[PDB]
């Protein structure tokens, strides 16, 4: 059985969404995924009765829709013709900029930091030494942001493009909270283990920002996660060690000024030294009145609002899905 509610986008003005029950059957099992639309061919019924007794004289019968044809409102791999046309690109030399030229044509400049994002999700090899140690197969990214930048659009492009990309927000906007804990479910009342998003994004890339507004609870978690790639717990009668092979990409916020002083970045930032050490690449954005850049940007804004050579994006996501494995 599946709950369904009214579409929040096309509400007539002032009114409220309501619910209805939908019952699945044999070949109709598990077509959807929560948070989507659906197009169903429903027959309209109600339940028969439950336990008529002394109540109000008004008969209260809840109505149930059974549906026949579940459809999406108006999954990706390689093929033989897709693995031989694959080799037509990979033989070339100038594929380096062309990847960056197909990354994000919205944000105009900033060639280095677009290249670093292109390198980070593209993956590494851990190459575990036999018996001794594995160093790392992950890329640790720091990006000191600035208000007055489209830095959220970069990580927005990541979650659309990548295979396993989970945006774990800074503070309380998502259901995740980056710390595993034994919780019950109000839908179901039993205790269920709920790992963090870093538990979730193993062999995936997580996107966490506003590090300054993160607690010491979060700060010990990020410290342990980049340390030995494994999270241990000591809850009620349970002691396990779950693994985590994430890759961390940041989006920070400068303290006070947009760029504080001649003082260095560790003096500019309000974070600590060991998380700075475990971060490898450090992307810095700039906010300055540059005469050529403002004419480009403002006319790009108006062109975006009068609306009132790169690889097409299906192929490059087919590229990295096939390559990284």
């Amino acid at each position: 059985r599946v709950t369904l509610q009214e579409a929040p986008g096309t509400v007539p003005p002032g009114r409220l969404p309501r619910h209805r029950e939908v019952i699945l059957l044999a070949d109709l099992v598990d077509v959807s995924k929560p948070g989507e639309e659906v197009e169903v061919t429903g027959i309209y019924k109600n339940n028969y009765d439950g336990n008529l007794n002394a109540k109000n004289g008004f008969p209260v019968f809840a109505t149930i829709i059974e549906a026949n044809s579940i459809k999406r409102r108006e999954v990706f791999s390689w093929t033989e013709e897709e693995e031989r046309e694959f080799r037509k690109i990979s033989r070339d030399r100038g594929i380096i900029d062309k990847i960056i030229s197909s990354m994000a044509p919205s944000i105009y400049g900033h060639r280095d930091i677009k290249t670093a994002v292109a390198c980070s999700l593209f993956g590494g090899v851990p190459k575990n030494v036999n018996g001794k140690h594995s160093i790392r197969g992950d890329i640790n990214v720091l990006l000191l942001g600035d208000p007055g930048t489209a830095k959220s659009q970069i990580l927005k492009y990541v979650e659309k493009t990548a295979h396993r990309a989970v945006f774990a927000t800074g503070q309380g906007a998502s259901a995740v909270g980056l710390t595993a804990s034994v919780r019950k479910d109000p839908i179901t009342k039993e205790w269920t283990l709920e790992g963090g998003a870093l538990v979730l994004a193993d062999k995936g890339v997580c996107l966490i920002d506003e590090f300054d507004k993160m607690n010491d609870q979060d700060r010990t978690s990020i410290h342990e996660a980049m340390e030995q790639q494994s999270i241990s717990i000591s809850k009620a009668g349970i002691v396990t060690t779950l693994q985590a092979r994430c890759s961390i990409i940041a989006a920070a916020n400068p303290n006070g000024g947009r760029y504080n002083s001649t003082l260095p970045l560790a003096q500019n930032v309000s974070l600590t030294e060991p998380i700075l050490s475990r971060f490898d690449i450090l992307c810095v954005v700039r906010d300055l009145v540059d005469e050529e850049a403002d004419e480009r940007l403002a006319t790009f804004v108006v062109d975006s609002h009068v609306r009132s050579s790169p690889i097409p994006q299906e192929l490059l996501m087919k590229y990295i899905h096939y390559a990284r494995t």
Partner: peptide
């Protein structure tokens, strides 16, 4: 037992 600080993600020391 390996500990970084007194605090793990959910394990006390």
């Amino acid at each position: 037992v390996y500990t970084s600080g007194k605090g793990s993600s959910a394990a006390g020391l």
